[PDB]
Each structure stands twice: as C-alpha cells, then as structure tokens.
Amino acid sequence: MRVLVTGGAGFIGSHLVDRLMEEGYKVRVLDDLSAGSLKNIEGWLGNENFEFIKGDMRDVEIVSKAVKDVDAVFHLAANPEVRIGSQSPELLYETNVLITYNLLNAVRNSGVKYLVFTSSSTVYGDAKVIPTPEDYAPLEPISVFGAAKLAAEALISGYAHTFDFRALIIRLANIIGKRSNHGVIYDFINKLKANPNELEILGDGTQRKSYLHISDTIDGIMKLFEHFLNGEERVDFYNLGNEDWITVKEIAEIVSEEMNLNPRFKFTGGVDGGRGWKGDVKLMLLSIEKAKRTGWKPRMNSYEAVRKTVREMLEE
Amino acid sequence: MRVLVTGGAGFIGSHLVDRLMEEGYKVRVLDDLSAGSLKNIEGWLGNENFEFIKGDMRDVEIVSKAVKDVDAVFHLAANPEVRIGSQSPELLYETNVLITYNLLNAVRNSGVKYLVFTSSSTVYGDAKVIPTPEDYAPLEPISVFGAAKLAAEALISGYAHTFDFRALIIRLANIIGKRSNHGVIYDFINKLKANPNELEILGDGTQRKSYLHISDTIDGIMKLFEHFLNGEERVDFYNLGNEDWITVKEIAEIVSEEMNLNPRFKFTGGVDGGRGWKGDVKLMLLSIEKAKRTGWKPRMNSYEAVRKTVREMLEE
Numbered sequence: 131m132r133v134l135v136t137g138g139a140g141f142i143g144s145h146l147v148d149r150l151m152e153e154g155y156k157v158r159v160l161d162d163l164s165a166g167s168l169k170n171i172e173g174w175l176g177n178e179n180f181e182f183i184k185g186d187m188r189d190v191e192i193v194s195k196a197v198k199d200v201d202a203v204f205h206l207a208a209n210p211e212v213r214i215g216s217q218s219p220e221l222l223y224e225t226n227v228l229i230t231y232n233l234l235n236a237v238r239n240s241g242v243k244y245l246v247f248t249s250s251s252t253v254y255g256d257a258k259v260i261p262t263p264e265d266y267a268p269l270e271p272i273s274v275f276g277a278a279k280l281a282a283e284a285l286i287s288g289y290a291h292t293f294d295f296r297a298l299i300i301r302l303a304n305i306i307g308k309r310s311n312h313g314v315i316y317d318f319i320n321k322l323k324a325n326p327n328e329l330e331i332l333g334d335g336t337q338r339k340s341y342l343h344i345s346d347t348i349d350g351i352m353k354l355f356e357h358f359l360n361g362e363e364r365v366d367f368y369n370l371g372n373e374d375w376i377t378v379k380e381i382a383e384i385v386s387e388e389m390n391l392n393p394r395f396k397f398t399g400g401v402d403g404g405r406g407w408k409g410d411v412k413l414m415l416l417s418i419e420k421a422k423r424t425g426w427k428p429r430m431n432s433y434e435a436v437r438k439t440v441r442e443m444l445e446e
Numbered sequence: 447m448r449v450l451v452t453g454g455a456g457f458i459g460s461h462l463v464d465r466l467m468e469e470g471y472k473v474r475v476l477d478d479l480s481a482g483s484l485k486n487i488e489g490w491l492g493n494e495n496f497e498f499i500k501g502d503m504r505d506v507e508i509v510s511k512a513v514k515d516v517d518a519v520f521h522l523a524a525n526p527e528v529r530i531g532s533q534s535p536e537l538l539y540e541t542n543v544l545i546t547y548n549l550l551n552a553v554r555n556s557g558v559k560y561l562v563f564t565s566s567s568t569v570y571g572d573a574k575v576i577p578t579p580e581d582y583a584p585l586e587p588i589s590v591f592g593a594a595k596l597a598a599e600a601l602i603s604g605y606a607h608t609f610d611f612r613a614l615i616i617r618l619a620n621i622i623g624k625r626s627n628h629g630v631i632y633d634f635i636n637k638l639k640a641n642p643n644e645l646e647i648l649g650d651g652t653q654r655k656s657y658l659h660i661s662d663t664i665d666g667i668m669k670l671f672e673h674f675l676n677g678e679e680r681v682d683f684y685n686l687g688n689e690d691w692i693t694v695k696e697i698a699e700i701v702s703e704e705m706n707l708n709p710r711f712k713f714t715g716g717v718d719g720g721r722g723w724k725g726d727v728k729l730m731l732l733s734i735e736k737a738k739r740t741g742w743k744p745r746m747n748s749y750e751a752v753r754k755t756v757r758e759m760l761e762e
C-alpha cells in the first residue's frame with residue numbers, strides 16, 4: 131500500500147514513517163522542513179521504498195503531485211504551536227486550514243482511498259465533561275489553533291462525503307518523546323540548559339493534561355488505521371490520549387529530577403485565570419474507551435511517559 | 447448601538463436590515479452584490495442612520511474599514527447554495543471560511559463586542575438524532591457547504607475566546623420568504639414558468655426539512671440577539687427552525703396549488719439514495735427548545751410558511 135505522509139519529517143510524522151517503512155509500506159514524505167528535520171528520516175533517505183519531497187502544502191501544484199499514485203494519505207503537516215495563536219493566527223490558519231483544504235482539493239482528483247488526519251484535543255477547548263468523549267459538544271474551541279484543527283476536521287469530513295473517500299480523524303492528547311522540538315518538556319530542559327538555578331514556568335503550574343508517549347501514539351494510530359480499514363464508516367472519530375494526567379509543576383519536577391537540578395521555580399501567573407496563554411486549556415483528559423475497544427491501550431501513563439521522554443531527550 | 451450587517455443586501459440580510467433600521471439601530475451594510483440587490487435596501491438610502499458599502503470581503507482593507515466604529519456585527523455574507531458544492535467547492539471555501547477568517551482578523555483590531563453568525567443545519571449533516579439539539583455530535587457534515595459553515599463556527603469561537611469578543615452562532619434551518627432568490631420553491635416556480643405541464647423534482651421527493659418563514663426568522667434572530675446581550679456566555683449556540691417539517695413532494699404540491707397548475711411530477715431518483723445532490727441532507731429538523739426558552743416561537747408551521755412564501759412570490 132502506498133502512503134503519503136505529509137509532515138513526515140516532523141516529530142510524530144517521522145515515527146509514523148519509521149513504522150510504515152518497517153511494515154513494508156511504500157512511503158512518500160511531503161514536508162517543507164519549516165519545523166521537521168531531514169535527519170529525523172535520514173535513515174530512510176536512499177531506501178527504495180522511500181521517497182522524500184521538500185514542498186510547501188500552500189502550493190497546490192505540489193499537493194496535487196504528491197497524492198498522485200497514493201492509496202492512503204496521513205496528513206500530519208501543520209504548525210502545532212498553540213502559543214503563537216495570539217500573535218500569529220495567520221500562520222495557524224494557513225498551516226492548519228489552508229493546507230488541509232489544498233490537500234483535500236488534490237485528493238478529490240486522485241485515487242487516494244484513505245485520509246488519516248491528526249486533529250487535537252483542543253477542538254473541545256475547555257471541555258466540561260471529563261474524561262471527554264468524542265461526541266462532546268457543542269465544540270467551542272478557545273484557541274485559534276483548536277479552531278483551525280476543528281475546521282480541518284469539518285472540511286475533511288465534507289470532502290470525504292462529497293467526493294467519496296474515507297476519513298479517520300484522530301484527536302490526540304499531548305504527545306511527547308524523542309525528536310520533539312516543541313512543548314513544555316523540551317522547553318524546560320533547554321531553559322535549564324541555559325541556567326540550572328531557576329525555572330520560569332508559564333502560568334500557575336496547575337494545568338493538568340493527558341500525556342502519551344510517542345510509542346503508544348504510533349501503536350494507537352496504526353491500530354486505528356487497521357480497524358478503520360476493516361470497518362465501514364466513511365468518517366470515524368477517535369480520541370487518543372493516556373488514562374491519567376499530570377500538572378505543569380509535576381512535569382517541571384520530573385525534568386529537574388532527571389537533569390539532577392533543583393532550581394527555584396518562578397511562575398509567571400498566566401492569564402485568563404492562570405493559563406499559560408490565551409487559549410491554553412487548563413484541564414484536558416480524553417475518554418479513550420472508544421479507542422481502547424480496538425485493543426489498543428497505552429503501556430505508559432503520563433508520569434512514565436514524561437520521565438521516559440526526558441531521559442530519551444537528554445541522551446541527545 | 448451601531449451594527450454592521452455583512453451580506454445585508456441578501457434575502458435574510460435585507461430583512462434584518464429593515465428590522466434594524468426600524469428599531470432605531472445605526473446600520474452599515476457590507477455587500478458585494480454578487481447575489482443580493484440594491485433594490486432590496488435602496489429604500490433606506492438617504493437615511494441618516496444607514497450606510498451601504500459595496501465591497502468583496504475577500505479584500506481585507508474593505509472589511510477592516512467596515513468594522514470601524516461598529517459595536518455589533520451580523521455576518522450574513524456567504525454563498526448559501528449547497529447544490530454547487532460538488533462542482534464549485536472553492537467558491538464555498540471562499541465565501542464561507544475565507545471571508546469569515548478575514549472578518550475575524552478585522553474584528554481583532556476593532557471595538558466589535560458582539561458577532562452574530564448565521565450558521566446552518568447542515569453542520570449536523572445526516573443527524574442521527576431528531577429533532578437535532580445544539581449539542582448533537584460528533585459533527586460530521588456531508589457537504590462542502592456544511593463543512594465550511596462549521597469551520598466558520600470554529601474560527602468564530604476560537605477568535606471570540608482569544609481576542610475577547612462574544613459570539614452568537616445561530617444554526618438556521620431552511621428559511622423561506624419574500625426576496626428569496628434561491629431554494630426549492632424559487633426553482634419549482636421558475637420551472638413551472640418555463641413549462642406548466644411538468645415538474646422535474648430533484649431526488650426522490652422524500653427529502654423532509656423544517657422551513658421557517660423569514661418573518662419568524664427575523665423575529666427569532668432579534669429575540670436571540672437581545673437575550674444573548676443579556677447573558678454571560680462568551681460563545682452561545684442556538685438552533686432556529688420550525689416545529690415541524692415537510693417533504694419536497696408536498697412543497698411541489700403546494701406550489702402547483704398556488705399556481706393553479708396540476709403538473710406531472712418527474713422525480714430524477716437522485717444519488718446516494720435519492721438525494722438531490724452530493725451532500726444534500728435528506729432529513730432535517732432542529733430542536734428549538736433552547737430558542738423557545740427566550741420567548742420566541744414561530745407563528746407559522748412549515749406548510750403555512752411555504753404557502754405564504756409562494757403567495758408573496760407570485761404577487762411579483
């Protein structure tokens with residue numbers, strides 16, 4: 131089966147690429163290398179089952195070309211950074227709504243049979259139902275990013291129904307692990323790289339979120355892809371997160387523990403009642419019962435995932 | 447209070463404009479007249495409280511100017527035609543997501559406190575729960591149009607939370623009445639103008655939908671707007687439709703009745719099981735309990751509204 135993996139040079143994208151290549155898929159990657167890295171996939175450069183394309187999905191010619199002779203598309207290309215939503219909503223609109231729109235228009239005029247899209251928990255915004263099921267609503271995202279992911283979901287479904295392809299929407303929790311160049315663990319480790327004595331923590335440290343290690347993330351993505359191929363649903367929605375959650379302050383504590391530092395915590399106090407930023411959901415914990423009915427389940431919890439991530443990262 | 451009404455030269459927009467002028471609002475209209483007409487609002491030209499701006503919302507300067515010195519925005523500008531979704535998805539993308547995105551970017555740099563958006567039942571797609579409540583989900587629109595409307599909703603919510611304005615999203619059912627230049631009644635009347643002996647009905651004729659007369663529609667929009675001004679929700683969702691529904695075949699029968707014709711109905715059999723087109727939802731009926739708790743209620747049911755619309759149209 132031939133698959134396009136947009137953003138396949140990214141953190142999650144390159145791991146999905148490793149998995150797909152190892153299972154014998156013929157994998158093309160489409161990535162402008164604005165945030166991913168060629169190194170993250172240099173092992174596959176030169177494999178006869180691997181093709182790489184440096185390309186911006188804003189460019190429709192590129193996107194029509196990349197989906198040509200592809201049976202499945204895994205659309206992971208995006209700017210995932212919620213932080214930049216209050217300064218750079220245009221960037222989030224483009225790299226979430228626009229490039230997905232172009233991908234779908236390309237998909238319409240091709241033989242692409244399956245579209246797997248990595249949406250986010252942020253579509254629920256500050257969800258009042260915990261653990262949050264996939265049918266929670268009304269969806270009132272509080273960040274430009276979550277709104278852009280919701281819009282991507284909507285357009286994916288509409289094109290799937292109108293132009294007769296199948297679509298699998300996977301709302302991911304916080305995903306952490308080796309090769310990640312963004313997030314709170316990364317930033318804590320590098321802040322302490324620059325100064326071991328203090329840790330500037332955005333917000334009040336009480337933000338509690340579900341963290342999944344990238345290993346469980348890819349196992350679950352593949353399990354859902356497997357089940358979805360065997361299923362009949364035109365469009366299917368799954369949450370993908372861990373069973374529990376952990377606070378920003380506890381994450382700072384684990385990162386300090388693993389770095390053998392004991393710095394002075396300095397919280398910025400946040401906004402909208404201690405959020406790290408405008409649109410930073412304070413509580414997130416996804417109901418993964420629907421995902422677990424496929425056989426998947428995380429082998430690590432949020433605390434284990436965070437600690438393993440810190441270790442893996444400090445090796446590099 | 448000064449309010450902008452984008453698309454205010456349209457069917458629903460021009461009636462909303464009439465209403466706003468009569469209640470003493472200061473009304474600016476922004477409309478490129480791609481589907482509306484100056485006739486529909488030329489009656490107000492020369493009033494000290496009325497300003498009209500001919501402009502396409504794709505142009506960001508136009509929209510930035512229009513929200514200048516406006517306290518509330520009624521964003522009715524769009525292409526509402528679902529039928530063209532499989533032919534012209536780019537057009538729906540532009541006139542639903544793009545110009546909504548531009549309006550929102552304009553609103554961020556303004557003093558607009560309230561944004562009211564005319565969403566559609568199509569966001570629910572083929573809803574499996576009927577009457578469909580505002581919290582039905584997962585939202586899986588089956589049309590490019592419904593997907594674009596949902597994406598617009600998402601961006602509205604995200605920007606409302608991020609940049610501190612409030613948003614009222616009103617999911618309208620099928621709206622019918624004077625000045626309507628689209629829909630099934632319009633097309634059936636013109637079909638029988640060209641040939642009174644026969645009527646081509648798209649689909650299998652069993653499509654059952656909730657119709658609201660434009661009078662009830664504007665009464666409800668104003669009730670909801672006032673109540674929303676009195677409420678605390680940063681973003682609030684309301685259905686706006688009738689209590690009942692009616693099939694396309696009964697609408698054909700009523701149109702024949704009022705035209706004193708009795709033609710031969712010829713149903714085209716449709717697609718995807720008798721739909722009028724790719725992405726045409728077959729059954730629609732929104733739960734209006736939430737709308738009715740504001741005091742609003744339709745004075746006409748679907749059959750009365752359809753008959754009133756046909757009569758009004760035939761006077762012209």
Ligand SMILES: NC(=O)c1ccc[n+]([C@@H]2O[C@H](COP(=O)([O-])OP(=O)(O)OC[C@H]3O[C@@H](n4cnc5c(N)ncnc54)[C@H](O)[C@@H]3O)[C@@H](O)[C@H]2O)c1
Pocket residue numbers: 136137138139140141142143160161162163164165166167185186187188205206207208209210225229248249250251301302303304305306311
């Ligand atoms: N990391 C998480 O915690 C997390 C959580 C939930 C959802 N997700 C989603 O999973 C997916 C993968 O995220 P990630 O952590 O691997 O991020 P990433 O930025 O590391 O990977 C995304 C890739 O997209 C590429 N890209 C950016 N703009 C592009 C464009 N215009 N055209 C082509 N390629 C472009 C980047 O260069 C990068 O290689 C995204 O959809 C993200 O929103 C991530």
Ligand SMILES: NC(=O)c1ccc[n+]([C@@H]2O[C@H](COP(=O)([O-])OP(=O)(O)OC[C@H]3O[C@@H](n4cnc5c(N)ncnc54)[C@H](O)[C@@H]3O)[C@@H](O)[C@H]2O)c1
Pocket residue numbers: 452453454455456457458459476477478479480481482483501502503504521522523524525526541545564565566567617618619620621622627
């Ligand atoms: N008619 C219905 O049954 C119905 C149902 C649900 C929702 N809605 C929504 O209500 C609103 C009004 O629909 P309507 O029936 O009055 O349609 P309409 O076309 O009569 O009115 C929409 C207006 O948008 C204007 N417009 C179109 N493209 C524009 C652009 N690029 N820039 C600026 N203005 C532009 C048109 O000229 C028109 O005046 C729309 O948002 C529509 O999607 C309508």
Ligand SMILES: C[C@@H]1O[C@H](OP(=O)(O)OP(=O)(O)OC[C@H]2O[C@@H](n3cnc4c(=O)[nH]c(N)nc43)[C@H](O)[C@@H]2O)[C@@H](O)[C@H](O)[C@@H]1O
Pocket residue numbers: 209210211212213250251252302303304305312313314315317318330331332333337339378405406407410
């Ligand atoms: C659900 C996922 O959310 C992901 O964002 P997101 O949760 O903020 O994930 P992070 O950026 O890791 O931030 C997680 C939490 O840690 C807080 N935090 C505290 N200090 C810091 C710091 O120094 N840096 C950062 N970055 N955070 C910090 C942050 O505000 C939030 O409460 C997205 O990247 C994905 O695309 C996806 O949307």
Ligand SMILES: C[C@@H]1O[C@H](OP(=O)(O)OP(=O)(O)OC[C@H]2O[C@@H](n3cnc4c(=O)[nH]c(N)nc43)[C@H](O)[C@@H]2O)[C@@H](O)[C@H](O)[C@@H]1O
Pocket residue numbers: 526527528529566567568618619620621628629630631633634646647648649653655694721722723726727
């Ligand atoms: C909910 C609202 O739905 C509205 O569309 P939508 O339901 O198709 O409303 P109409 O365009 O009126 O079509 C209503 C039903 O009548 C069918 N139909 C049968 N024959 C005809 C015909 O000759 N012409 C037309 N036009 N329809 C016909 C049509 O496919 C559908 O099943 C949108 O205009 C609004 O923006 C909003 O989305």
